[PDB]
C-alpha cells in the first residue's frame, strides 16, 4: 500500500499514487493533480 492524501511524502516517487509531494513543509501528499 502506498501513501494516501495528506500522507507523509519524501519525494514524488515516494508518494506513489496520483498525488504530488508537497512543495511546502510539512511535505505531505496533496491532491493537486486535478487535471
From Swiss-Prot:
Role played: Potent and selective inhibitor of hNav1.7/SCN9A (IC(50)=610 nM). Also shows a weak activity towards Nav1.3/SCN3A (IC(50)=7950 nM). In addition, inhibits voltage-gated potassium channels (Kv) in rat DRG neurons. It does not alter the voltage dependence of activation, but it causes a small hyperpolarizing shift in the steady-state inactivations of Nav1.7/SNC9A.
Tissue and organ distribution: Expressed by the venom gland.
Shown residues within the full chain: 51 to 85 of 87
Domain notes: The presence of a 'disulfide through disulfide knot' structurally defines this protein as a knottin.
Record-given protein name: Mu-theraphotoxin-Cg1a
One annotated GO molecular function: toxin activity
Keywords, ordered alphabetically: Disulfide bond, Ion channel impairing toxin, Knottin, Neurotoxin, Pharmaceutical, Potassium channel impairing toxin, Secreted, Signal, Toxin, Voltage-gated potassium channel impairing toxin, Voltage-gated sodium channel impairing toxin
Gene Ontology cellular component annotations, sorted alphabetically: extracellular region
Misc: Negative results: does not inhibit TTX-resistant sodium currents on rat dorsal root ganglion (DRG) neurons. Has no activity on voltage-gated potassium channel Kv2.1/KCNB1 expressed in frog oocytes. Does not show activity towards Nav1.1/SCN1A, Nav1.2/SCN2A, Nav1.4/SCN4A, Nav1.5/SCN5A, Nav1.6/SCN8A, Nav1.8/SCN10A sodium channel.
Chief place where the protein resides: secreted
Compartment list: Secreted
Cysteines engaged in disulfide bonds, as pairs: 2-16, 9-21, 15-29
Organism: Chilobrachys guangxiensis (Chinese earth tiger tarantula)
